[PDB]
């Protein structure tokens, strides 16, 4: 008959076979993550091999249907995904070499270890000891030496691999019709074929930089305040006008500033909002916390969980011989099977994490009716944003009072809100300049504007420029500092975190406004209102069928990301920071260098 009819039949055969093969592979991954044994490793490999091999022939056979004969705008999307998700253009030797490089990068990152100076006696790993030292230790020498030692022993070995790695990825990208790997990553947000909603790959660079221009005043005031508090801790080392040393940010790479809350507390005399003791007094266990989390979801109108989740999901550490990865995850095995894997303790963080992980589960069931190739979020940022807005309303004092963990006698004043706002700012606002810079630097090197001999000169130049952080020890081209990061060494796109942060605050304002909320935005509860849940559920059930530009307009009435909701949320903190920066100069100086 016609191309559309012939293509429609092919998808029907692929749709049924994919679900069965995907289910077996996912179950193998779940089996090993809970029962760490060598045979389950093999089961993961055997299941993974068949799933990977199956996606190869299907993509190859899908190339016989030209895309210009389809005008349904839905079969085209399904066919497009297959032709790019498993198709290989590199040669056999290059394919093997590229996989070997990636496998080497992942293994060396896990096996990379540094240890005490001038002593080969005892050595440790990054997660157990290095993270704790960077998070808590206040010794200048210990922090500075550990920062330098790990980078030297990890970046230098990974430097030659990265140079070979960028070569093959550009060759694969140039073999395709994309300009380069940088354009390859930016193609996720592209929307084509719809009038009034089209998006271009090159437009993303303009919008990302444009949004960062409006957030500059907020970040510098926080930087000025943080620098002032650091003076009371380390007087001699830090200059009032220079950049902060890179080894005094509370962690290994300075991604988050949450570790500095104790040092930079605005008002330490005021009590902190803590319910860990209250939960212990009321004798809360793993099941009660999750039942409470589930109840919050029902009150907005969303359906609550099935019997399969409760029977299958493990919510406590098995211990003994049974060892499992304790990192929280939201598992979607498909075919009506949903499970959550996380080790849970009686803390507020696990109480908040329970809401965070349940949000991803609810999103999964909304688009369960969509075809197999459309069971995903609109872009890489929407799925993360949904799981974060629910934690925003789960930490409000009003929600805690309603549950009963927080005493009704608790009062709110100047300092309870300001302290809470500064805690959130150190985590969200701090990472944004770091997030925007790292994705930017990877773009030029993939573009080829920055030569290899000037990777580090350009790297640290922007660190003193945008982030306003100066390295404590100079580094030549031998090191590979970006490769020391997990995402860079493992080839993961990093722009998804910049877009996610903007998206979550747009969603919260839309839901709070719909729920007829009044007052400050940071005190908002959406538990009782059923109108907010209905509006949110409309976007979730869409899946990948509609363009993300249209989906956003159905929620916030806009076709593009905006930063104004984020500033309004932090507006009360902005005015106070201006008051505290009356006598402190705003802005860092790029000329200063800690090492003379």
């Amino acid at each position: 008959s016609t191309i559309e009819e012939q293509a429609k039949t092919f998808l029907d055969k692929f749709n049924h076979e994919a679900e069965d093969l995907f289910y077996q592979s996912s179950l193998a991954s779940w089996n090993y993550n809970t029962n760490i044994t060598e045979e389950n490793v093999q089961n993961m490999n055997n299941a993974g091999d068949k799933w990977s091999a199956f996606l190869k022939e299907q993509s190859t056979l899908a190339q016989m249907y030209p895309l210009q004969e389809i005008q349904n705008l839905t079969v085209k999307l399904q066919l497009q995904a297959l032709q790019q998700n498993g198709s290989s253009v590199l040669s056999e030797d290059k394919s093997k070499r590229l996989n070997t490089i990636l496998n080497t990068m992942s293994t060396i990152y896990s096996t990379g270890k540094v240890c005490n100076p001038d002593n080969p006696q005892e050595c440790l790993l990054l997660e157990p000891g290095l993270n704790e030292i960077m998070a808590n230790s206040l010794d200048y020498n210990e922090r500075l030496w550990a920062w330098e030692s790990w980078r030297s022993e990890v970046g230098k070995q990974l430097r030659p691999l990265y140079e070979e790695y960028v070569v093959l990825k550009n060759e694969m990208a140039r073999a395709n019709h994309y300009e380069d790997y940088g354009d390859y990553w930016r193609g996720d947000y592209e929307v084509n074929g719809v009038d009034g909603y089209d998006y271009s790959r090159g437009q993303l660079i303009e919008d990302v930089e444009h949004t960062f221009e409006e957030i500059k005043p907020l970040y510098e005031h926080l930087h000025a305040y943080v620098r002032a508090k650091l003076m009371n801790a380390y007087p001699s080392y830090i200059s009032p006008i220079g950049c902060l040393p890179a080894h005094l940010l509370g962690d290994m790479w300075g991604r988050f500033w949450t570790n500095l809350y104790s040092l930079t507390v605005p008002f330490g005399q005021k009590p902190n909002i803590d319910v860990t003791d209250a939960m212990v007094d009321q004798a809360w266990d793993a099941q009660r916390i999750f039942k409470e989390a589930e109840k919050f979801f029902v009150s907005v109108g969303l359906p609550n969980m099935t019997q399969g989740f409760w029977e299958n999901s493990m919510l406590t550490d098995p211990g003994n011989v049974q060892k499992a990865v304790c990192h929280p995850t939201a598992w979607d095995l498909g075919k009506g099977d949903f499970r959550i894997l996380m080790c849970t303790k009686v803390t507020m963080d696990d109480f908040l994490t329970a809401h965070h992980e349940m949000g991803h589960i609810q999103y999964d069931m909304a688009y369960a009716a969509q075809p197999f190739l459309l069971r995903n979020g609109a872009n890489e940022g929407f799925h993360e944003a949904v799981g974060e807005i629910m934690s925003l309303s789960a930490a409000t004092p009003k929600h805690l009072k309603s549950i009963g963990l927080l005493s009704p006698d608790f009062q709110e004043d100047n300092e309870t809100e300001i302290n809470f706002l500064l805690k959130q700012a150190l985590t969200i606002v701090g990472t944004l300049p770091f997030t925007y810079m790292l994705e930017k630097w990877r773009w030029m090197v993939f573009k080829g504007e920055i030569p290899k001999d000037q990777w580090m000169k350009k790297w640290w130049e922007m660190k003193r420029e945008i982030v306003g952080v100066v390295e404590p020890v100079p580094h030549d081209e031998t090191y590979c500092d970006p490769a020391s990061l997990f995402h860079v060494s493992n080839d993961y796109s990093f722009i998804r975190y910049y877009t996610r942060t903007l998206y979550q605050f747009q969603f919260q304002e839309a839901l709070c406004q719909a729920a007829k909320h009044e007052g400050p935005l940071h005190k908002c509860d959406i538990s009782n209102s059923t109108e907010a849940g209905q509006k949110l559920f409309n976007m979730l059930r869409l899946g990948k069928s509609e363009p993300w530009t249209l989906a956003l307009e159905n929620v916030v009435g806009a076709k593009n990301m905006n930063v104004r909701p984020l500033l309004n949320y932090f507006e009360p903190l902005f005015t106070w920071l201006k008051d505290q920066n009356k006598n402190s100069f705003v802005g860092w100086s790029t000329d200063w260098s800690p090492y003379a």
Partner: protein
């Protein structure tokens, strides 16, 4: 899964032939635009309702 036409009420069909979808003849073999019409279910105790 595939059939040339619909079914009249209270009818059965056990014919198992390659459902031709392309213009060229299937010639009794599977492959490009030549799919088997019968597809099997999959039942496991962990499947959702």
């Amino acid at each position: 899964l595939f059939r040339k036409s619909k079914l009249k009420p209270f009818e059965r069909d056990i014919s198992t032939e390659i459902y031709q979808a392309g213009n060229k003849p299937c010639n009794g073999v599977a492959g490009s635009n030549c799919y088997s019409p019968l597809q099997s279910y999959g039942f496991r105790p962990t499947y959702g309702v």
